[PDB]
Design an enzyme around this catalytic site. Structure first.
Site, PDB file in Angstrom:
ATOM      1  N   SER A  57      47.787  11.321  56.661  1.00  0.00           N
ATOM      2  CA  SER A  57      47.308  12.593  56.126  1.00  0.00           C
ATOM      3  C   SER A  57      48.265  13.017  55.023  1.00  0.00           C
ATOM      4  O   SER A  57      49.414  13.381  55.296  1.00  0.00           O
ATOM      5  CB  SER A  57      47.219  13.658  57.216  1.00  0.00           C
ATOM      6  OG  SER A  57      46.710  14.868  56.686  1.00  0.00           O
ATOM      7  N   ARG A  58      47.794  12.969  53.778  1.00  0.00           N
ATOM      8  CA  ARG A  58      48.682  13.151  52.641  1.00  0.00           C
ATOM      9  C   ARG A  58      49.024  14.618  52.406  1.00  0.00           C
ATOM     10  O   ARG A  58      49.994  14.911  51.703  1.00  0.00           O
ATOM     11  CB  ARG A  58      48.035  12.518  51.413  1.00  0.00           C
ATOM     12  CG  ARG A  58      48.855  12.545  50.150  1.00  0.00           C
ATOM     13  CD  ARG A  58      48.089  11.804  49.077  1.00  0.00           C
ATOM     14  NE  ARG A  58      48.014  10.388  49.415  1.00  0.00           N
ATOM     15  CZ  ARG A  58      47.272   9.492  48.778  1.00  0.00           C
ATOM     16  NH1 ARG A  58      46.564   9.812  47.715  1.00  0.00           N
ATOM     17  NH2 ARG A  58      47.238   8.243  49.228  1.00  0.00           N
ATOM     18  N   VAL A  59      48.254  15.542  52.984  1.00  0.00           N
ATOM     19  CA  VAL A  59      48.669  16.938  53.000  1.00  0.00           C
ATOM     20  C   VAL A  59      49.869  17.117  53.917  1.00  0.00           C
ATOM     21  O   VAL A  59      50.777  17.905  53.625  1.00  0.00           O
ATOM     22  CB  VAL A  59      47.503  17.840  53.432  1.00  0.00           C
ATOM     23  CG1 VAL A  59      47.975  19.275  53.583  1.00  0.00           C
ATOM     24  CG2 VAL A  59      46.354  17.741  52.442  1.00  0.00           C
ATOM     25  N   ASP A 113      42.288  12.350  50.053  1.00  0.00           N
ATOM     26  CA  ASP A 113      43.698  12.626  50.311  1.00  0.00           C
ATOM     27  C   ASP A 113      44.204  11.867  51.530  1.00  0.00           C
ATOM     28  O   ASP A 113      45.292  11.282  51.495  1.00  0.00           O
ATOM     29  CB  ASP A 113      43.914  14.127  50.499  1.00  0.00           C
ATOM     30  CG  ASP A 113      43.235  14.953  49.430  1.00  0.00           C
ATOM     31  OD1 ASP A 113      43.800  15.078  48.325  1.00  0.00           O
ATOM     32  OD2 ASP A 113      42.134  15.478  49.695  1.00  0.00           O
TER      33      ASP A 113
END
Ligand SMILES: Nc1ncnc2c1ncn2[C@@H]1O[C@H](COP(=O)(O)OP(=O)(O)OP(=O)(O)O)[C@@H](O)[C@H]1O
Ligand SMILES: Nc1ncnc2c1ncn2[C@@H]1O[C@H](COP(=O)(O)OP(=O)(O)OP(=O)(O)O)[C@@H](O)[C@H]1O
Ligand SMILES: Nc1ncnc2c1ncn2[C@@H]1O[C@H](COP(=O)(O)OP(=O)(O)OP(=O)(O)O)[C@@H](O)[C@H]1O
Ligand SMILES: [Mg+2]
Ligand SMILES: [Mg+2]
Ligand SMILES: [Mg+2]
Lengths: 53, 477, 469, 120, 484, 128, 120
Positions: free
Chosen positions: E349-351, E324
């Site tokens: 940070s794809r979250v 992610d």
């Protein structure tokens, strides 16, 4: 007088810049050709390894 | 089929033979057409021969006869002044070779204990080499550079120079020479032989040739057989020089041979074995101890780079073997510096013990001086101006003409003058003229100096002061 | 009765044997062939089936004939070990090659062994003061640690190892082992001469260095196993005699290279750029035995060759994982005339931490690296536009960086043949003081050349008073 | 030309256009025969394949076959293995230039890029 | 008979072709008569390709082989905490047997689409740069990628060391149990890691799985899956856990060796075709489970080494594609004194901010914009040209901020300490200090707040969000302190 | 097209595009287990495009009078005329109409790169 | 999607994420199926597998399917054979760029490289 000297100095500086940039163009042209040959050879070795199965 | 076999298949220089039960590995075999081959692979039920000739000469179903001998070559004094191909057949057109014996092509290099550190000079007669990157007898000194940069000129001048000693009776000072042409045009080898015959040097040199048309196995084999030829001088207490011109084409021939065996390619398509080729070729160059008779075999391997790429795979692998390298740069060969020795990259890891003490004295720390001159030239301040004048006139002083090898007794005064500063009195464009006059003067006025330098080889303060005063007595006019 | 078989195939360094009986030799066992020139030793590499066993020859395979008898020794290649091994030169097979006669050891041990277990590993920090400025400052070495000298062809690795031996091996109280793996023979002869001159060897008395040499002329299998032979000697000193041990290896890349040489003949599919598939695990099996343990301390210096000057090549790349301190040598730095050509930024060490060396030393080294990285970053601008275009802060930093670069050079005594400068050995505290002073600008005035090939700041002052003449 | 040299003694010119395509055809023939390619995909036995052609072009007691060979270099790269193996054999090079032709110079041989081994 | 047993045909390089074993399952475990164990990976019409978990020197042609009847599995439970185990779960610290709650197969189906939940809560790493710019959420996967000796292990080890602030506490929903997987490393490195984790007294809550370089290729291959199984027990029992893989590149190398010696057809760079499948099936096992499935989570930190900085290579490309979020460590930044060497441009940070602690989200909001503007303005200024004072302000504040992120090794900062620093950086009142002495400021400022302003720290921790009153209070405190 | 050519009429054939056809031939060659070459193409790919393209001709007044013009189309990758198939086709053909995307963005449509475009034969045929 | 098109008669949106995975997956099996690897390791059948997938998606006279499909670009290289082969099948290309995203500009569409059939 200062203005005339400044423009002359600019001509000198840009001439030297073009000279050194040409030298670097030569170096990186040689490096580019070398790397191109290396890329072709290494990409071919994988195919040869696979075909020898 | 114990001592004989028959061919199963032939192709791309590789032949498969049924039978030959009792053949040794690396043994020589004779085909029914007279062409010969090396038993390389001993698989069960079949043998893999590689052909020392055009594969047209062998066809399926023909019988193959065992020779009973490992691949070998003649050796002895009789080869001197001849031209031979690999496997040692006389191709000069004169009578059959007379040989003191025969030796295997790939005898193992001598080990640790037999050797001595190399403590005698190979006088090349080239000012830059003799002064800044000397070669000791038994050393392995790479000659590396791009196409048409005087590599063969350097090696050939070294070969030509030995005439002043080879005419004597002192076997301890002589230096016999072998020159190994691999991948060169046949016409080039013929013209080089003509050059050697014109300078009367042929009578003490041997030429081994594997020309460009020769089958790849012969190009692969030539340096090994030539090394065997030199090892007889090494092992009988005589001194030999061997030039390989050049190992890059041997590497290419070995690449051909290996790929047609379908062994996997490695980096830059060379096989992983390619290091071992040149390593076991070159480690045979050595100087043996007083117990073994003090013999030696000096190697001068040539390498052809692309664009000055000393980082290439084969150049680096060879440098990993040889004790030093003489790097010839095109960027200096064009613009007229010849022999164009780039002193920045050139080094001799066993050099400083080889020089005659006179030349080491006068040449004191020149290798550092000309590296400092590089720093000055890269970028007036009167100190930098002083060093710049010295640098320009010194580099002019190092230039030399082809086929004119200076004796060391004549080199010493020139480097003396250049280092201790008298050449500030002569404008650089006339330095060559200066030399031609100066040496003639020394040859007709007080030859005493040259006699002392020749016999003693070292300068006492009396000699040192005499040479100062005489060079002053010249430079004043 | 002996277990015997017959040769069936020979290809390069690989020999295949076939046994009429079912009592096959175990893998890694040694077999003997009575070739007239002296018995050849084969090492079993694989079992092929049909009671055929594939083996690696430890000597030239010329003269072998299909159907020649082979005899199993009943164990791995076994080499002498013991205090008698000191002052002697031994071959990969374990045979003497100094011609002084048989080694009278009470024991003889196999070259293949298991690495020491995790419960036996021991970790401790202690800087080994080498006497070399760049190492002692930017990548300190550690006693009991593993050290690596990465470098291309002809960039100073061997002179570096010789200087390390010249400085450390005489002061260190424990024994030493030198393992020449694929080095040039002249180098081994010169090492033997020097060690007899410096008194580390004495044929009429005691000695405290052992020598194992398999030189670059040897066939590939010997160049493979000779490193393990040297490791066996070092292990016997470490564990049984309880001594501290030095282990110099030149050059360990060769061990990997030899493998590739045989790999194709062994019948394997080649890996990237032609290396053997087992490269990582074979190198691991060799390399994990070199460690320190609770029984004794081994300090090892390993020269690592770099093919085509490519530090990304799989062999150096996989070698970096195994070392506590590494000092890359660069051809570029050497070509500038800077020796020992250690790259001051690419070198790294586990020991350079404030907890170990104290805050002052760590701060000084950090500042030096900051300056050199700033200088490296400006190279394009400096080359194209010239130094006049730089900002004042950056121009001052560039001058200081150039002075630092040249200050890090050092004349080794072993290099007197080339420098014309008698060698200098520089203490650690002096090095830190000298560089601290320069970073504070105290010596801005004296020129760039004053720092070249001089030991310590006061030697710089003296060379400045020499250049001012 | 070999017959002319060896049986009538004339000095003969063997023009070849283009030698690069000789190398390329050799490479294709090699590939179809199942040989493992050399660097940058050229054939193995490149050097000796060229040599068997070039060595025959030489002088003898009777006459000579001189050869003027047009050379194409890919990517303007003088280092490519085919141009390199070709240059290894050449005794002289003649360089024609578009710019020099634009200057009205005719036959437009560049006098400074052109070079000869025998200008000696 | 040849159904339950087999006969060795050929053996070498750690691979053994065996005849018989007609009933053996794919990937099943076997015991050789000489006691060495192996795993079956090739089934072919008359041969079994078994790969040895040990030195092949103890195997001999014609030897007998016994089917185990078990597919490869490892012990799992709370007893593994505070221990060091090899790939197959055997203790190697030598501290005695291991208690197990059960066994779990090495490879297992990842949790599906239904059971999962949104990445909902933080993994506080204690690194200012990571926690402020590129947060990691519980259940996320965060690739840590960079060249040799760039601080990768330091970053992961700091992330492990930081958890002591909660793992000693009562609330198990706040804890985080750490599994470390060492692949292809020399044993002494693992020894120093355990020594560090004991010096900091950290490894009450840690498990170390080791497959060191000498151990045969199958073990280096198998280690990550077994460690994943070891963590999945925490995951499934409602206990949060985090796995570090140091590193997956050497696992890929081990698989390349293993597959090549089985003579499977190679792929690109001689890696087998399945090399994407290998990492993808490994990494999908990280998950945050929904309330129905006990709410536990397993987080992953896979480390990757790029040769020469070549992020474009095959394995780096695959792992970048799978994970992610990515954290890039640049060698160049390390020497400039920017340590840890996080290249904030490439790192993402794809979250995203959903995983961040809300107070730090409030203060850190514009930090990313400041640094993005700086990356352009500083690059422009590097050419030597001058520019208007607005670009000068962006340059100055960005320089101070970049100096603010630097951090000492093995010193993790709580968010209650990160918040004041990032507040001072973004809001201002920390842009006037000399660049060299920022390190003096950052150390002292906290030491001041911990005594003169303790209530603010207490509220920043416990209520986790900054009201207008707290923002005004920190404004006042920053203005007050910086004036000194 | 050859039918028209041979029966005295004029025709023009546009191959759109030959690189994709080369890829198709690569598929066939690799699945037939023929030896690979550079970029996994069979060695015969020069012979393939040569055997196609040499069919365009202007026949002499004796052999009818027709012609067959050809306009093969090639897709470069990142402007790499150095690539293998582009190299072969550039060698085989009589000239080159070259298109650069940078010009296409500038509103210079149909974006002929005048510098790199050349016509060796056509200048003899251009209308007066 | 096909059943909706050809029987239900409805218009359809067919979203695919990520179609590179369709190519990549085909590569992984390709080696084990005994095929020689193509350029940079992709399967020989890359083009025809891509076609057999894509050309089923179309607006026949019976109904309309509108497909928006994502393509992963390895190492941001648009010339990689997978994206390069995928371009041929598309009416509109929304090329997103590393650079534009790095500028802090979202949705990071490259205004120059992105193109569409209907811009007419
Ligand atoms: N000292 C010199 N003075 C003048 N000309 C020289 C000198 N050394 C070499 N040359 C000339 O340089 C040219 C190249 O010399 P040479 O044949 O030795 O080069 P090379 O590097 O061996 O070439 P190749 O790569 O073709 O084998 C020849 O014209 C030779 O005459
Ligand atoms: N301190 C030094 N001062 C000057 N020159 C040095 C110094 N150290 C090394 N050199 C130079 O390094 C050159 C090569 O050194 P060395 O033989 O150690 O190289 P190497 O990298 O080990 O090469 P190889 O791979 O060929 O064994 C020597 O010629 C010597 O001139
Ligand atoms: N923030 C930091 N400040 C100072 N030194 C640091 C910092 N982070 C790491 N280091 C040091 O940098 C060196 C490399 O650190 P680390 O061991 O984390 O690297 P790594 O990338 O995991 O290495 P490897 O590739 O060898 O596994 C060590 O000396 C470590 O002490
Ligand atoms: Mg020459
Ligand atoms: Mg060395
Ligand atoms: Mg690490």
């Amino acid at each position: 007088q200062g203005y005339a000297a400044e423009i002359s100095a600019r001509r000198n500086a840009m001439d030297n810049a073009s000279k050194n940039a040409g030298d670097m163009i030569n170096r990186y042209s040689i490096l580019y050709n070398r790397t191109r040959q290396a890329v072709i050879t290494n990409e071919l070795v994988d195919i040869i390894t696979g075909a020898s199965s | 089929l114990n001592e004989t076999g028959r061919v199963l298949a032939v192709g791309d220089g590789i032949a498969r033979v049924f039978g030959l039960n009792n053949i040794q590995a690396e043994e020589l075999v004779e085909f029914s057409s007279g062409v010969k081959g090396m038993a390389l692979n001993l698989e069960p039920g079949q043998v893999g021969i590689v052909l020392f000739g055009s594969d047209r000469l062998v066809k399926e179903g023909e019988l193959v006869k065992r020779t009973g001998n490992i691949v070998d070559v003649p050796v002895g004094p009789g080869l001197l002044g001849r031209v031979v191909d690999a496997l040692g057949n006389p191709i000069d057109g004169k009578g059959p070779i007379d040989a003191a014996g025969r030796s295997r092509a790939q005898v193992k290099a001598p080990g640790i204990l037999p050797r001595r550190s190399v403590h005698e000079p190979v006088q090349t007669g080239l000012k830059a080499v003799d002064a800044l990157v000397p070669i000791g007898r038994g050393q392995r000194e790479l000659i590396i550079g791009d196409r048409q940069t005087g590599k063969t000129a350097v090696a050939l001048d070294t070969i030509l120079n030995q005439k002043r000693w080879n005419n004597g009776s002192d076997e301890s000072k002589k230096l016999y020479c072998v020159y190994v042409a691999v991948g060169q045009k046949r016409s080039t080898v013929a013209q080089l032989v003509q050059t050697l015959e014109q300078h009367d040097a042929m009578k003490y040199s041997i030429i081994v040739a594997a020309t460009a048309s020769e089958a790849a196995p012969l190009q692969y084999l030539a340096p090994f057989t030539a090394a065997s030829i030199g090892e007889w001088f090494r092992d009988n207490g005589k001194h030999a020089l061997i030039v390989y011109d050049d190992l890059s084409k041997q590497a290419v021939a070995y690449r051909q041979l290996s790929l047609l065996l379908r062994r996997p390619p490695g980096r830059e398509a060379y096989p992983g074995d390619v290091f071992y080729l040149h390593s076991r070729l070159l480690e045979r160059a050595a100087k043996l101890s007083e117990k073994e008779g003090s013999g030696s075999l000096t190697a001068l391997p040539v390498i052809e780079t692309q664009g000055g790429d000393v980082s290439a795979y084969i150049p680096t692998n060879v440098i990993s073997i040889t004790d030093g390298q003489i790097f010839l740069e095109a960027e200096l060969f064009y613009k007229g510096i010849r022999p164009a020795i780039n002193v920045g990259l050139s080094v001799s890891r066993v050099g400083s013990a080889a020089q005659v003490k006179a030349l080491k004295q006068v040449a004191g720390s020149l290798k550092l001086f000309l590296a400092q001159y590089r720093e000055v030239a890269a970028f007036l301040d009167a100190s930098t101006k002083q060093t710049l004048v010295r640098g320009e006139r010194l580099t002019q002083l190092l230039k030399q003409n082809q086929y004119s090898p200076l004796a060391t007794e004549e080199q010493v005064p020139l480097i003396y003058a250049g280092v201790n500063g008298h050449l500030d009195g002569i404008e650089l464009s006339r330095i060559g003229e200066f030399e031609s006059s100066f040496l003639s003067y020394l040859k007709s006025n007080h030859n005493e100096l040259l006699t002392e330098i020749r016999e003693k080889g070292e300068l006492s303060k009396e000699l040192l002061a005499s040479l100062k005063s005489a060079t002053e007595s010249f430079v004043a006019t | 009765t002996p277990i015997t078989g017959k040769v069936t195939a020979v290809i390069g360094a690989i020999v295949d044997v076939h046994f009429e009986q079912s009592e096959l030799p175990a893998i890694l066992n040694a077999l003997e062939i009575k070739t007239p020139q002296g018995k050849l030793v084969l090492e079993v590499a694989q079992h092929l089936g049909e009671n055929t066993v594939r083996t690696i020859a430890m000597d030239g395979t010329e003269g072998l004939v299909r159907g020649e008898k082979v005899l199993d020794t009943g164990g791995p290649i076994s080499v002498p070990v013991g205090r008698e091994t000191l002052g002697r030169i031994i071959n990969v097979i374990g045979e003497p090659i100094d011609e002084r006669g048989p080694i009278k050891s009470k024991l003889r041990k196999p070259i293949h062994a298991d690495p020491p277990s995790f419960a036996e590993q021991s970790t401790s920090a202690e800087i080994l003061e080498t006497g070399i400025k760049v190492v002692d400052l930017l990548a300190p070495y550690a006693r009991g640690g593993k050290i690596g000298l990465f470098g291309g062809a002809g960039v100073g690795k061997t002179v570096f190892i010789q200087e390390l031996i010249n400085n450390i091996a005489k002061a260190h109280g424990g024994f030493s082992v030198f393992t020449g793996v694929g080095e040039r023979t002249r180098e081994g002869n010169d090492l033997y001469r020097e060690m007899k001159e410096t008194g580390v060897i004495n044929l009429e008395g005691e000695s405290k260095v052992a020598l194992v040499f398999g030189q670059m002329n040897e066939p590939p299998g010997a160049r493979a196993r000779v490193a393990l032979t040297g490791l066996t000697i070092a292990e016997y000193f470490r564990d049984e005699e309880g001594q501290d041990v030095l282990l110099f290896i030149d050059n360990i890349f060769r061990f990997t290279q030899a493998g590739s040489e045989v790999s194709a003949l062994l019948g394997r599919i080649p890996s990237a750029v032609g290396y053997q598939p087992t490269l990582a695990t074979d190198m691991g099996l060799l390399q994990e035995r070199i460690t320190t343990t609770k029984k004794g301390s081994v300090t090892s210096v390993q020269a690592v060759y770099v093919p085509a000057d490519d530090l990304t090549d799989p062999a150096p790349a996989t070698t970096f994982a195994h070392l506590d301190a590494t000092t890359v040598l660069s051809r570029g730095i050497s070509e500038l005339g800077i020796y020992p050509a250690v790259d001051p930024l690419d070198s790294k060490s586990r020991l350079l931490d404030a907890a170990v060396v104290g805050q002052e030393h760590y701060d000084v080294a950090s500042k030096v690296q900051e300056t050199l990285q700033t200088y490296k970053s400006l190279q394009d601008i400096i080359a194209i536009l010239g130094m006049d275009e730089l900002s004042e802060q950056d121009k001052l930093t560039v001058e200081r960086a150039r002075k630092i670069q040249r200050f890090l050079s050092q004349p080794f005594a072993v290099a007197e043949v080339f420098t014309g400068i008698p060698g200098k050995l520089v203490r650690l505290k002096d090095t830190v003081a000298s560089f601290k002073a320069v970073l504070e600008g105290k010596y801005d005035n004296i020129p760039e050349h004053a720092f070249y090939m001089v030991g310590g700041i006061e030697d710089v002052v003296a060379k400045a008073e020499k250049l001012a003449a």
